[PDB]
């Protein structure tokens, strides 16, 4: 029989990260 | 083109690891569908997946990339039987004569 | 006065701590605020929630209960060093010297039967 | 062998005052000083580098050169570890430590070379975030606060 | 996770109120994981063996 | 030899059970485990009821020990339900409920056995030997 | 130990949870301290089954999953987390936590099934 897979519409997550000054340089 | 895609596979293998490189190789070449279409290739595909799982289990304990290749060549040269490195059952849905 | 705050979830306790801090401010600005936690993730989540509520989260000390109790022992009673003489490694290295000295006693014959069979200073440590 | 030269160098550091009025480090009591202040700073907007570097260059005079760095939109928390915060005559001050200084052996470490090092290593953003964190800390702690 | 006592410890012989054990700590961790879940709770355990297809029973808490 | 009844076996001294191929050995083991937990048998019973941490079960295969632990846990839960309901659908459970006079104390003991089922002393041979070597290390001389 | 203190000031701030879901039902039964387990002492309580609480078939709050290997377990978990992210439009992966009994045994499998996802499927871990 025929079978298909579901597809995610959007991105799973935004750019959320707890960084420091060295992360921004 | 083959050398370029193998260099991309080497870059994925150096950046992301073993199983991402093997999954990108099995998805771009589409070799899993061809092995499932071939009669008698499901056991070969399960053996390939188990070898990939064992290579990923042995690749986290090693830093160098050639060290995993030397470990795989040694375990090929060493036929010793461990509880994790044995062959599994290929299929369970299809009924087979069990010796 | 010892205040005990019973609550079902942790967000109500965090809101009550925020209301306590915003209600009564500290007289000394450089005085650290002692918040007793057990793990590092709890202190990190408390720091993130206090930074989200206040706009900043700094000079907040998260010590162990044993470390805070020993600090209060040092601060209240004088003539006390900052480190305890009875620690795990210190008592281990003391007992490794004291146990061969006490093998001649009658009360330590069980440790003598456990120790004097074969010893390359492995069972003793 | 380095120990007897290092301690007198330390006293040479301690004898040198670091203020606009000439306040040394020996005049700071234990309650006035605070070493290694850890702060968390929240941000709910996507941090755009083009909208931030222009706002820095509008007021900071050291941003004449220094072409702007590129980073993604960062939304969430920012960690920071200030080396020292100390008060004196009713005024708060910040102090940080940089000690690599490999390329200088003579007395050429003037204000121009230090400004060039600040522009090269981009410590202006770090000092501006430190001033923002100290302003928020003194606003949250001390009532009736003026910057 | 079961951690057997040393055997010659006197705290395991006569327990008090303030005594702490790893089994009770794990049960309280399971209680805090049940309470702390707000929207969705997912639980997965190995039920069938990959080697001999043997039935693997779950924990007593589940 | 004699025939074996799981509710009439005297649990005194040494007994030798010869379970043939295909017989309910794991069921007889679970029945004797419930008998040792509840203290049943009358004159052939134990002088005192024992807890879960006092019944030692030794089986070689680890999967056999896991299956026996799961089956004993299921039997404890089923007997607790049948004692709370005073009824069951199994004849051996019916005779087990008929053998006891009290229901509240037996239900409390079965509840404490269900709660202490994680600390059950059902180990293998080498596991029991390692546990006895690590527990009483002084008289044995083990690291 | 807390109730034994003499000069303790006890304050209670309990937010009640409306029992609609199964997890909210369990939390309400824990908070209200009541026994909803039907033993069935009589045959009338054993025959009828509508005396319990109704559970909707679409309630996916608490689910129990049986897997065959540590690889397939987290491979199912990744697809279920993708389905949960697709089911709710406002859902952050920061608000999702995964706790394992042993981290060192499952962490190779977790990293393997989390690194193999494509760019449209990859969630940060």
XYZ file of C-alpha atoms in Angstrom:
726
model
C 0.000 0.000 0.000
C 0.872 3.676 -0.438
C 2.532 5.471 2.488
C 3.872 9.004 2.985
C 5.846 11.064 5.514
C 4.745 14.276 7.229
C 6.825 17.414 6.635
C 7.603 20.228 9.070
C 6.306 23.597 7.893
C 8.737 25.998 9.593
C 12.092 26.086 11.363
C 12.273 24.234 14.709
C 13.802 27.154 16.616
C 15.175 30.690 16.540
C 18.762 31.659 17.410
C 18.466 31.479 21.201
C 21.821 31.137 22.960
C 23.282 32.339 26.262
C 26.702 33.621 25.189
C 29.425 35.986 26.394
C 31.590 38.770 24.964
C 33.909 36.169 23.421
C 30.930 34.691 21.578
C 30.186 38.035 19.911
C 33.810 38.485 18.782
C 32.089 15.493 -9.495
C 32.800 12.245 -7.637
C 35.977 13.704 -6.109
C 34.080 16.859 -5.118
C 31.284 14.921 -3.426
C 33.817 12.685 -1.672
C 35.612 15.797 -0.414
C 32.250 17.011 0.868
C 31.775 13.643 2.560
C 35.226 14.034 4.124
C 34.276 17.511 5.355
C 31.067 16.164 6.909
C 33.052 13.289 8.440
C 35.580 15.718 9.937
C 32.933 18.174 11.181
C 29.849 16.135 12.127
C 31.061 12.564 12.649
C 30.544 9.053 11.302
C 26.782 8.502 11.196
C 25.991 11.880 9.537
C 28.519 11.121 6.789
C 27.133 7.607 6.328
C 23.552 8.899 6.246
C 24.426 11.575 3.684
C 26.189 8.916 1.600
C 23.209 6.544 1.819
C 20.775 9.373 1.008
C 22.651 10.987 -1.892
C 23.577 7.706 -3.593
C 20.198 6.186 -2.580
C 21.877 2.822 -1.987
C 19.437 1.753 0.750
C 16.486 1.717 -1.652
C 18.554 -0.263 -4.160
C 19.573 -2.790 -1.496
C 15.956 -3.131 -0.342
C 14.833 -3.610 -3.951
C 17.424 -6.351 -4.505
C 16.365 -9.799 -3.301
C 18.619 -10.949 -0.479
C 19.970 -7.471 0.272
C 18.034 -6.798 3.479
C 20.495 -8.827 5.553
C 23.299 -6.881 3.865
C 21.559 -3.613 4.756
C 21.120 -4.655 8.391
C 24.795 -5.643 8.510
C 25.741 -2.255 7.041
C 23.594 -0.492 9.648
C 25.111 -2.533 12.486
C 28.636 -1.830 11.221
C 27.735 1.868 11.080
C 26.405 1.752 14.647
C 29.558 0.004 15.873
C 31.773 2.495 14.023
C 29.861 5.370 15.619
C 30.169 3.720 19.042
C 33.928 3.298 18.539
C 34.436 6.730 16.958
C 33.463 8.773 20.011
C 36.221 7.172 22.087
C 38.844 8.102 19.454
C 40.061 11.596 18.578
C 41.880 10.973 15.297
C 40.065 10.039 12.100
C 42.571 7.431 10.905
C 42.430 5.742 14.315
C 38.861 4.597 13.645
C 39.947 3.188 10.277
C 42.770 1.292 11.986
C 40.306 0.038 14.612
C 37.937 -1.150 11.877
C 40.760 -2.920 10.033
C 41.865 -4.548 13.297
C 38.334 -5.737 14.109
C 38.132 -7.079 10.558
C 41.411 -8.919 11.183
C 40.151 -10.050 14.618
C 37.231 -12.506 14.259
C 36.689 -12.585 18.024
C 33.037 -12.744 19.076
C 31.648 -10.198 21.538
C 28.050 -9.899 22.688
C 27.551 -6.614 20.809
C 29.461 -7.531 17.627
C 27.357 -10.564 16.654
C 24.986 -10.852 13.715
C 21.343 -10.113 14.454
C 18.128 -11.457 12.971
C 17.503 -9.953 9.545
C 13.692 -10.039 9.553
C 10.896 -10.885 11.989
C 7.684 -10.403 9.982
C 8.462 -13.020 7.330
C 8.262 -16.553 8.718
C 11.390 -18.662 8.182
C 12.390 -22.221 9.024
C 14.364 -21.832 12.256
C 17.354 -24.160 12.568
C 11.943 35.401 62.192
C 12.247 32.291 60.017
C 9.844 32.455 57.064
C 8.766 29.233 55.333
C 7.158 29.512 51.886
C 5.048 26.535 50.794
C 4.017 26.475 47.136
C 2.976 23.979 44.482
C 5.285 25.171 41.686
C 8.537 27.112 41.499
C 7.359 30.128 39.485
C 5.255 31.329 42.421
C 8.309 31.095 44.683
C 10.393 32.992 42.123
C 7.721 35.697 41.920
C 7.634 35.882 45.718
C 11.425 36.249 45.842
C 11.205 38.983 43.196
C 8.524 40.745 45.253
C 10.657 40.409 48.397
C 13.707 41.898 46.669
C 11.716 44.724 45.062
C 9.879 45.368 48.348
C 12.933 45.594 50.638
C 16.146 46.854 49.044
C 19.615 46.257 50.455
C 21.245 49.010 52.498
C 24.757 47.975 51.433
C 25.082 47.838 47.618
C 28.272 45.763 47.626
C 26.810 43.208 50.049
C 26.251 39.898 48.214
C 22.815 38.289 48.366
C 23.046 34.737 49.709
C 20.741 32.324 47.862
C 21.309 28.742 49.010
C 21.045 26.195 46.184
C 22.138 22.586 45.706
C 23.099 22.290 42.020
C 24.584 24.547 39.360
C 21.582 24.299 37.036
C 19.268 25.585 39.756
C 21.527 28.596 40.316
C 21.758 29.170 36.555
C 17.971 29.097 36.157
C 17.590 31.441 39.136
C 20.163 33.803 37.610
C 18.340 33.760 34.270
C 14.944 34.388 35.873
C 16.281 37.196 38.073
C 17.931 38.764 35.022
C 14.643 38.502 33.118
C 12.659 40.042 35.984
C 15.104 42.748 37.107
C 17.080 43.485 33.944
C 20.281 42.372 35.704
C 21.488 39.587 38.016
C 24.859 40.228 39.656
C 26.616 39.894 43.021
C 24.386 36.935 43.928
C 26.302 34.198 45.747
C 25.096 30.583 45.520
C 27.050 28.600 48.135
C 26.572 25.114 49.520
C 24.644 24.723 52.789
C 27.733 23.191 54.413
C 29.934 25.980 53.043
C 27.516 28.639 54.290
C 27.302 26.941 57.694
C 31.097 26.839 57.982
C 31.281 30.480 56.873
C 28.836 31.406 59.634
C 30.938 29.336 62.050
C 33.972 31.400 61.029
C 32.146 34.743 61.157
C 30.371 34.203 64.490
C 32.962 32.367 66.553
C 36.568 33.622 66.439
C 39.889 31.765 66.375
C 38.627 29.399 63.668
C 40.478 28.789 60.374
C 38.692 28.961 57.043
C 39.239 25.244 56.339
C 38.226 22.320 58.529
C 40.968 20.031 59.807
C 38.698 16.972 59.450
C 38.247 16.443 55.711
C 37.910 13.263 53.666
C 41.423 13.214 52.199
C 42.993 14.481 55.425
C 41.302 11.814 57.542
C 42.211 9.204 54.918
C 45.900 10.144 54.992
C 45.787 10.278 58.798
C 44.161 6.853 59.116
C 46.608 5.338 56.624
C 49.324 6.200 59.158
C 47.267 5.416 62.273
C 45.934 1.981 61.250
C 49.337 0.215 61.204
C 49.993 1.727 64.638
C 46.714 0.313 66.014
C 47.105 -3.242 64.682
C 48.731 -4.377 67.942
C 45.504 -3.738 69.875
C 43.023 -6.503 70.662
C 40.057 -4.544 69.267
C 41.619 -4.328 65.781
C 42.154 -8.058 65.202
C 39.549 -8.081 62.421
C 41.441 -5.355 60.562
C 44.631 -7.319 61.251
C 43.135 -10.429 59.635
C 41.959 -8.246 56.744
C 45.296 -6.420 56.395
C 48.214 -8.653 57.425
C 47.470 -11.391 54.871
C 48.956 -9.508 51.908
C 49.569 -5.756 51.751
C 51.335 -3.656 49.125
C 49.627 -0.590 50.651
C 46.484 -1.038 48.552
C 43.870 -2.382 50.981
C 45.075 0.052 53.655
C 44.343 3.150 51.571
C 64.144 33.080 40.582
C 61.301 35.281 39.308
C 59.755 35.656 42.772
C 61.815 38.549 44.250
C 61.437 40.589 41.054
C 57.718 39.785 40.730
C 56.722 40.963 44.211
C 58.452 44.305 43.849
C 56.801 44.589 40.456
C 53.540 43.905 42.250
C 54.351 46.703 44.669
C 55.204 48.851 41.663
C 51.732 48.048 40.395
C 50.255 48.815 43.823
C 52.144 52.102 44.191
C 50.865 53.399 40.842
C 47.526 55.223 41.272
C 44.726 54.642 38.754
C 42.238 57.524 38.865
C 41.604 60.999 37.503
C 42.292 62.371 41.005
C 45.181 60.057 41.918
C 43.561 57.356 44.056
C 45.671 54.265 44.714
C 44.523 50.696 45.327
C 45.634 50.715 48.976
C 42.865 53.170 49.936
C 40.133 50.641 49.040
C 38.660 48.719 51.965
C 37.298 45.178 51.799
C 33.648 46.279 51.779
C 34.242 48.771 48.959
C 35.817 46.235 46.586
C 34.053 43.431 44.736
C 36.080 40.991 42.629
C 34.698 38.979 39.695
C 31.114 40.211 39.544
C 29.129 37.799 37.367
C 26.157 39.352 35.576
C 23.432 38.126 33.237
C 21.991 40.698 30.822
C 18.694 40.025 28.995
C 17.825 41.048 25.452
C 14.453 40.396 23.805
C 15.113 42.021 20.416
C 17.129 40.418 17.595
C 20.556 42.030 17.938
C 21.289 43.587 14.542
C 24.949 44.458 14.032
C 24.180 47.309 11.624
C 21.768 49.018 14.031
C 24.239 48.580 16.912
C 27.553 49.572 15.321
C 26.079 52.844 14.049
C 24.720 53.606 17.526
C 28.193 52.913 18.924
C 29.900 55.072 16.282
C 27.460 57.925 16.946
C 28.887 58.488 20.440
C 32.121 56.504 20.835
C 35.147 58.383 19.419
C 37.225 55.191 19.093
C 34.893 53.850 16.364
C 36.404 56.015 13.609
C 38.132 52.981 12.127
C 37.290 49.400 13.133
C 34.975 48.096 10.377
C 31.963 46.442 11.970
C 31.887 42.795 12.989
C 29.189 40.470 11.652
C 27.135 38.263 13.971
C 23.719 36.626 13.888
C 20.575 37.890 15.622
C 21.169 36.961 19.272
C 18.053 36.925 21.467
C 18.238 35.737 25.061
C 20.860 36.181 27.781
C 24.431 37.484 27.832
C 26.976 36.425 30.447
C 29.741 38.631 31.784
C 32.472 38.572 34.426
C 33.672 42.005 35.560
C 37.088 41.866 37.221
C 36.663 44.532 39.911
C 34.042 47.062 41.004
C 34.965 49.589 43.683
C 33.497 52.749 45.197
C 35.423 55.824 46.321
C 34.227 59.169 47.761
C 30.695 58.205 46.737
C 31.491 57.298 43.126
C 31.585 53.853 41.523
C 34.378 52.662 39.229
C 35.129 49.571 37.150
C 38.476 47.832 36.665
C 39.474 45.072 34.242
C 42.756 43.241 33.676
C 44.559 42.635 30.380
C 47.986 41.048 30.657
C 48.992 39.424 27.349
C 51.039 42.391 26.068
C 53.548 40.354 24.086
C 54.665 42.956 21.541
C 55.878 45.678 23.929
C 59.073 45.665 25.990
C 60.022 49.352 25.912
C 58.034 52.330 27.253
C 55.995 52.634 24.036
C 52.719 51.626 25.758
C 51.328 55.155 25.700
C 47.671 56.170 25.393
C 47.816 55.921 21.589
C 49.105 52.338 21.624
C 46.508 51.369 24.231
C 43.765 52.967 22.127
C 45.040 51.070 19.079
C 44.953 47.838 21.093
C 41.399 48.643 22.213
C 40.402 49.241 18.585
C 42.133 46.060 17.384
C 40.879 43.645 20.051
C 37.465 45.398 20.067
C 37.225 45.888 23.826
C 34.970 48.922 23.297
C 31.852 46.752 23.046
C 32.909 44.877 26.187
C 33.444 48.122 28.109
C 30.112 49.492 26.866
C 28.305 46.336 27.984
C 30.123 46.630 31.318
C 28.900 50.216 31.692
C 25.359 49.116 30.816
C 25.487 46.276 33.351
C 26.883 48.549 36.067
C 24.223 51.172 35.308
C 21.468 48.560 35.575
C 22.997 47.181 38.783
C 23.224 50.606 40.423
C 19.678 51.384 39.259
C 18.274 48.146 40.694
C 20.234 48.299 43.958
C 20.410 51.984 44.928
C 17.164 53.945 45.011
C 17.239 57.498 43.630
C 20.152 56.700 41.324
C 21.729 59.009 38.745
C 24.188 57.807 36.117
C 19.935 3.142 40.630
C 20.689 0.875 43.600
C 23.817 1.527 45.679
C 24.459 -1.174 48.280
C 25.686 0.024 51.698
C 29.172 -0.669 52.999
C 27.839 -3.157 55.571
C 29.882 -1.839 58.505
C 28.162 1.566 58.429
C 26.148 2.278 61.576
C 23.735 4.715 59.901
C 22.189 1.887 57.859
C 21.575 -0.178 61.011
C 19.547 2.412 62.962
C 17.931 4.874 60.524
C 16.907 8.365 61.625
C 14.724 11.081 60.114
C 17.505 13.079 58.456
C 19.135 10.061 56.808
C 19.426 10.149 53.013
C 19.412 7.129 50.697
C 19.806 6.961 46.930
C 16.613 4.933 46.433
C 14.442 7.494 48.214
C 16.265 10.260 46.335
C 15.459 8.562 43.022
C 11.814 8.090 44.016
C 11.597 11.765 44.974
C 13.257 12.624 41.652
C 10.558 10.660 39.834
C 7.908 12.485 41.870
C 9.474 15.859 41.027
C 9.648 14.869 37.348
C 5.952 13.964 37.429
C 4.999 17.227 39.155
C 7.333 19.503 37.164
C 5.850 18.398 33.828
C 3.385 21.061 32.674
C 2.111 20.144 29.192
C 3.463 16.803 27.956
C 5.131 13.819 29.621
C 6.982 11.319 27.420
C 8.232 7.998 28.814
C 10.201 5.438 26.800
C 11.788 2.213 28.046
C 13.401 -0.812 26.411
C 10.725 -3.511 26.421
C 12.113 -6.091 23.989
C 15.727 -7.239 23.871
C 17.728 -6.553 20.720
C 19.740 -9.780 21.144
C 17.270 -12.594 21.874
C 13.906 -10.752 21.677
C 13.309 -11.241 25.397
C 10.649 -9.293 27.273
C 12.231 -6.546 29.398
C 9.943 -5.391 32.196
C 9.834 -1.673 33.091
C 10.627 -0.162 36.485
C 8.336 -0.378 39.501
C 7.675 3.379 39.420
C 6.385 3.311 35.838
C 9.714 -39.735 45.155
C 6.500 -37.915 46.083
C 4.142 -35.517 44.347
C 4.589 -31.788 44.934
C 1.812 -29.473 46.099
C 2.812 -25.782 46.274
C 0.454 -25.114 49.212
C 1.468 -28.186 51.252
C 5.262 -28.171 50.866
C 7.055 -28.147 54.254
C 9.595 -25.314 54.125
C 11.925 -26.857 56.696
C 15.337 -28.373 56.075
C 16.474 -29.366 52.588
C 14.004 -30.262 49.831
C 14.736 -31.460 46.291
C 12.202 -30.536 43.592
C 12.564 -32.312 40.233
C 10.618 -30.210 37.729
C 10.233 -32.072 34.439
C 10.370 -30.525 30.975
C 7.420 -28.260 30.221
C 6.151 -28.148 33.806
C 5.238 -24.902 35.545
C 8.524 -24.380 37.373
C 8.342 -20.572 37.303
C 4.746 -20.751 38.528
C 5.699 -23.064 41.385
C 8.556 -20.703 42.274
C 6.160 -17.748 42.327
C 3.685 -19.735 44.443
C 6.410 -20.631 46.944
C 7.526 -16.987 46.949
C 4.007 -15.847 47.851
C 3.868 -18.633 50.454
C 7.123 -17.415 52.019
C 5.925 -13.798 51.907
C 2.502 -14.361 53.479
C 3.568 -17.227 55.753
C 1.064 -19.892 54.721
C 0.924 -23.626 55.326
C -0.251 -23.988 58.909
C 1.803 -26.710 60.574
C 4.171 -26.936 57.590
C 4.550 -23.142 57.415
C 7.458 -20.914 58.359
C 7.704 -19.926 62.043
C 7.584 -16.247 61.018
C 6.717 -14.279 57.865
C 9.680 -12.840 55.979
C 10.105 -9.703 53.891
C 11.255 -9.271 50.284
C 14.867 -8.562 51.305
C 15.086 -11.908 53.145
C 14.011 -14.284 50.340
C 17.011 -15.395 48.269
C 16.306 -16.723 44.765
C 19.259 -18.069 42.769
C 18.993 -18.651 39.015
C 21.855 -18.884 36.542
C 20.538 -16.994 33.508
C 20.106 -13.249 34.001
C 17.102 -13.077 31.667
C 15.524 -15.908 33.661
C 16.021 -13.869 36.837
C 14.464 -10.803 35.196
C 11.483 -12.826 33.959
C 11.040 -14.398 37.399
C 11.203 -10.979 39.064
C 8.572 -9.608 36.692
C 6.341 -12.643 37.179
C 6.656 -12.442 40.971
C 5.826 -8.723 40.847
C 2.756 -9.455 38.712
C 1.712 -12.251 41.078
C 2.130 -9.947 44.085
C -0.031 -7.294 42.421
C -2.678 -9.840 41.402
C -2.802 -11.368 44.886
C -3.056 -7.898 46.437
C -5.985 -7.091 44.141
C -7.628 -10.450 44.890
C -7.184 -9.876 48.630
C -8.646 -6.370 48.410
C -11.580 -7.790 46.416
C -11.865 -11.102 48.342
C -12.331 -12.830 44.974
C -10.263 -14.086 42.053
C -10.481 -16.039 38.801
C -7.618 -18.485 39.518
C -8.025 -21.687 41.561
C -4.567 -21.462 43.131
C -5.280 -17.843 44.061
C -8.631 -19.042 45.416
C -6.927 -21.586 47.678
C -4.358 -18.955 48.691
C -7.171 -16.603 49.717
C -8.931 -19.475 51.499
C -5.779 -20.319 53.467
C -5.532 -16.894 55.148
C -7.908 -15.766 57.892
C -7.007 -12.053 57.994
C -7.296 -9.713 55.016
C -6.143 -6.256 56.146
C -2.734 -7.317 57.465
C -2.134 -9.507 54.412
C -3.081 -6.623 52.119
C -0.727 -4.283 53.983
C 2.076 -6.849 53.735
C 1.430 -7.265 50.005
C 1.464 -3.480 49.581
C 4.795 -3.282 51.402
C 6.093 -6.106 49.194
C 4.982 -4.235 46.080
C 6.727 -1.101 47.315
C 9.869 -3.065 48.280
C 9.903 -5.068 45.028
C 12.796 -2.967 43.693
C 15.000 -4.140 46.591
C 14.234 -7.827 45.999
C 17.080 -10.289 46.607
C 16.716 -12.222 43.349
C 20.266 -12.384 41.972
C 22.441 -14.767 39.977
C 25.147 -17.046 41.371
C 28.127 -14.853 40.483
C 26.203 -11.715 41.431
C 25.361 -13.133 44.851
C 28.983 -14.213 45.304
C 30.261 -10.748 44.367
C 27.722 -9.120 46.695
C 28.766 -11.366 49.585
C 32.448 -10.711 48.849
C 31.933 -6.933 48.753
C 29.601 -6.873 51.776
C 31.627 -8.882 54.309
C 35.048 -8.042 52.907
C 36.839 -8.363 56.260
C 36.344 -12.086 56.879
C 36.823 -12.944 53.195
C 39.693 -10.635 52.229
C 38.341 -9.061 49.041
C 39.111 -5.685 47.507
C 11.497 18.481 60.236
C 10.146 21.847 59.056
C 6.955 21.571 61.125
C 8.980 20.866 64.289
C 10.485 24.373 64.280
C 9.082 26.652 66.976
C 9.660 30.164 65.581
C 8.894 29.228 61.963
C 6.492 31.394 59.954
C 4.598 29.254 57.436
C 3.138 30.896 54.322
C 1.210 29.008 51.637
C 0.780 30.201 48.031
C -0.801 27.297 46.131
C -2.173 27.884 42.628
C -4.892 25.339 41.891
C -4.753 23.437 38.592
C -7.987 22.881 36.684
C -8.195 19.128 35.937
C -8.795 18.805 32.189
C -5.889 16.745 30.817
C -4.582 13.454 32.195
C -1.378 15.024 33.528
C -3.426 17.835 35.063
C -5.712 15.164 36.532
C -2.716 13.460 38.148
C -1.352 16.765 39.457
C -4.772 17.692 40.874
C -5.064 14.287 42.551
C -1.605 14.771 44.067
C -2.281 18.346 45.213
C -5.773 17.728 46.616
C -4.607 14.546 48.412
C -7.392 12.211 47.262
C -7.607 8.572 46.168
C -9.171 8.111 42.722
C -8.047 4.478 42.380
C -11.110 2.216 42.257
C -10.371 -1.032 44.102
C -13.769 -2.624 43.509
C -14.680 -4.142 46.867
C -18.186 -5.029 45.653
C -19.396 -6.611 42.426
C -21.425 -3.512 41.531
C -18.275 -1.378 41.491
C -16.420 -4.084 39.540
C -19.098 -4.506 36.854
C -19.663 -0.850 35.970
C -16.723 1.191 34.689
C -18.222 4.688 34.293
C -17.369 5.565 37.916
C -13.795 6.400 36.849
C -12.617 9.551 35.056
C -13.085 9.752 31.267
C -9.877 9.925 29.234
C -10.085 11.457 25.772
C -8.370 9.465 22.989
C -6.731 12.650 21.656
C -5.108 13.433 25.033
C -1.396 12.983 24.274
C -0.106 14.401 27.572
C 1.292 11.167 29.055
C 2.450 8.444 26.658
C 4.451 5.270 27.296
C 6.677 3.865 24.552
C 8.285 0.436 24.127
C 11.461 0.298 22.027
C 13.976 -2.377 21.037
C 17.374 -0.633 21.145
C 18.942 2.611 22.410
C 19.313 3.809 18.808
C 15.689 3.170 17.821
C 14.477 4.689 21.098
C 15.981 8.110 20.439
C 15.158 7.777 16.735
C 11.503 7.481 17.764
C 11.971 10.292 20.295
C 13.295 12.661 17.614
C 10.293 12.018 15.361
C 7.916 12.448 18.299
C 9.550 15.757 19.239
C 9.218 16.869 15.614
C 5.529 15.917 15.729
C 5.132 17.879 18.970
C 6.841 20.901 17.405
C 4.535 20.621 14.385
C 1.417 20.212 16.544
C 1.909 23.487 18.442
C 2.911 26.676 16.593
C 4.218 28.398 19.753
C 6.656 25.858 21.192
C 10.342 26.432 22.062
C 12.907 23.603 22.190
C 14.295 25.308 25.299
C 11.038 24.361 27.060
C 11.664 20.679 26.185
C 13.883 18.570 28.449
C 15.035 14.962 28.026
C 16.309 13.064 31.081
C 18.045 9.688 30.801
C 18.896 7.189 33.519
C 22.478 6.850 32.232
C 23.868 9.699 30.143
C 27.031 7.940 28.952
C 25.172 4.959 27.477
C 22.578 6.915 25.480
C 24.603 10.036 24.597
C 26.339 8.470 21.545
C 22.933 7.423 20.211
C 21.436 10.836 21.007
C 24.270 12.663 19.238
C 24.012 10.238 16.308
C 20.274 10.701 15.784
C 20.508 14.469 16.389
C 23.407 15.100 13.999
C 22.000 13.102 11.082
C 18.989 15.374 10.529
C 18.965 17.692 7.484
C 18.730 21.475 7.722
C 14.923 21.474 7.607
C 14.836 18.715 10.253
C 17.707 19.739 12.546
C 16.867 20.968 16.041
C 19.665 22.246 18.306
C 20.649 20.056 21.251
